[PDB]
Amino acid sequence: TFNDVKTSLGITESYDIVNAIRNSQGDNFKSYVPLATANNVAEVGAGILINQTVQNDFITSLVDRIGLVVIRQVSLNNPLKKFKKGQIPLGRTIEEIYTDITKEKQYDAEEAEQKVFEREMPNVKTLFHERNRQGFYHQTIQDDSLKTAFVSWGNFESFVSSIINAIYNSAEVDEYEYMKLLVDNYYSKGLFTTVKIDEPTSSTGALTEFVKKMRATARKLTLPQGSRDWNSMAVRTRSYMEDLHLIIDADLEAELDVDVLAKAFNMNRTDFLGNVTVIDGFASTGLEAVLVDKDWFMVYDNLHKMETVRNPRGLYWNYYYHVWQTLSVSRFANAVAFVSGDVPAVTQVIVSPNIAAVKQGGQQQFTAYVRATNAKDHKVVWSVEGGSTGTAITGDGLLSVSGNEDNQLTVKATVDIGTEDKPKLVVGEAVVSIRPNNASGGAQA
Template identity: 30%
Template sequence: MPQSKLAKATTEALGHQVTDDQIFKNALDSMGPENNLPGYHAGDNFVPYGQSFLNNPETYFDYLNTIAVKYGLVFIKQSLAQNPLYNFKRGQIPYGGKIESVVFDTISPKVYRPDKITGSESPFAQNFGRVVGKTYTQWFDIESSNTIVDTQDTMFFQNLQQFHDFVYGKVAQLVNGAVLDEFYHTKLTLSKSLADGMIAKTTVDNVKELQKQILYYARRFQYFSRDNNSMGINQATHVSDIEVLVPLKTSIDIDVDFVANAFNPELFKATQVHFTEVDAFPDVWTYSADHVVTSDDIDKGYVDGRVHPVGSTIKKGSIATANATDAEQKLVGDKVGAIVLDRDALQLWDALPLTLSTINNPKKRYTNIFLNQKTALMFVQALNSRAIMLK
């Protein structure tokens, strides 16, 4: 029997066969006996259940709520939209804690001189090694919703597969939108850090030179050096923690054999790093001065009135929309040929993981499905990172 998109996604996420019948039965069981629906068995005619949903919007709401919560991780894991940078996720921020990556610089030894015992040579003299914790943090804090009209949307399903396809599609609309938005803001965190000088830069003339520089820094990062990051911290990165991010525009020009060889565990054991392709790195525009929001800013789409109402002030240096008043371009994303970085340089911490919930309006017979997420997107300047720029 054909599977719905919900059943297929659940099967792929769990690694074993899950049918629409099982999903339906498990959901009804989770709702409890008060759902006023008869017990369901595999192969039962869906029509009477559909009729019950049509006549009891609250029961339909309970079912949607159960599916959204119970299968929330399935929707997220199997979403059509994917965030290639998801591997930078670190988990959830500890309650009440502030995430800060502390980096320790090395201390250079001196030649032994037993005759020097005063001043800075005294055994009681204090010598504080350099400890750096500078990070750029951007909060990704979102909400979205999707509405299902109970007594209208349930009228058109002739079987369980069609019903689950619809439910899956409505939830997937929310999840795909959130995943795409998080992906964009993760890339924007890198672009903004680069624009602000937090990532060291090297400029090349062509793709062949780009290939050499990717390989050079993928190896160079494994050796202690003060040239591997913009703060001059003496750092080395373990080979398994080296990431190479390449935009599609340059990725298609990079020699296939180069990628196969340079990151082949057998041929180049010392350069086995993680290679990730992204669609593009965003341009960066920032406000060159404190900007007071006007109605014109909102009307032209330069500013979101929900976030910055008329009369509010956007601080100098804040991210701006392209060509907005008082904004200047700080980075052309297409000039970024690749970014080589320590995996810990980019960190995504969830204050609230992507979460689904529902609310029902019985008077108007509709259900709202809500999505919420709050994530800290962080870049650690003191760890190794190098952007290879194209002229």
């Protein structure tokens, strides 16, 4: 019951094609002039939203019936489901473990006289993942209320299936969004390593420059000697060329074909150098392309269970599709952000012993890794918070825990950017525990 419906509901008319035809002379509508019943075709021929009971053309008291019902059916998939790593049925934590390279010590035979049993610890960094996503897709079918919209069982049984298929399309869309959220999360954290570019689709020269920064970075990533420059934990990480995925957008694909790859005599010298996927676009401001390993994405399922129930008091069913999965990102893989706009100068400060457990009165050495986007060297300010009086730290990065320390510490490697009115300081951080000693007391120590 809707009582006042025009055919043009929602419509903004451009030029009234009915009046535009009959008021034509040589206005290119003259081919629509010999159409006999065009003004009826121009009325409802763009689809009608709200139905209205149209009386029959011969006998007025009869109505015009629906003679065909088409139930359109879609299948939405995930491009990114090849980046998943499988399922984890039991347990909720994933433990990545990574030993890193050493630092070469000089041959010194006189120093080595006392240091044979030195016990230099290895450089292991750990990263823990967890089940994040835990949610369900609710739908309700009122199986007997929907029997009034149908006069055929073949369509009613097909419309019930379409409501079912909608639950599975809300899966593979939100799975696609939660993985794209992992890129926009990781960039808002500043954990991506930024390569500054210029925006393409403004000129060819902005695009050709971009392809030169594509193929250079993907070769810098897969150099055999590795690099520290492209991770979030700053470890030596070689990657391989077959493992490299490029998650650009649908704008750089067709522009590269037309402006560049069409006029290429040797297409393999101007194409992107890794695997290429195509998306709708990253919702972060300034982000265009992302170059990552497949080892970056860590998507482990945990549950996929469609459960039903029927309400007897009101005749509906309810269908619950529970999706539980682990949606996180490795900080050991090469992850390159191709960022167009302005960037901060330093995006991240990586202090190298992130987890330290030095003793009461001992020493921990700290090495910071400033992630600068420019050749300006930045001076690093060390500090230490959460502690007591005698805890101090050297401007080289050497902690000196007091003899009277019991608190869980935290050290900081501050790097500022802006001026004193807008101080703009990015800062790294490592957590130090104390674990009290023995053999102490008194005074003059």
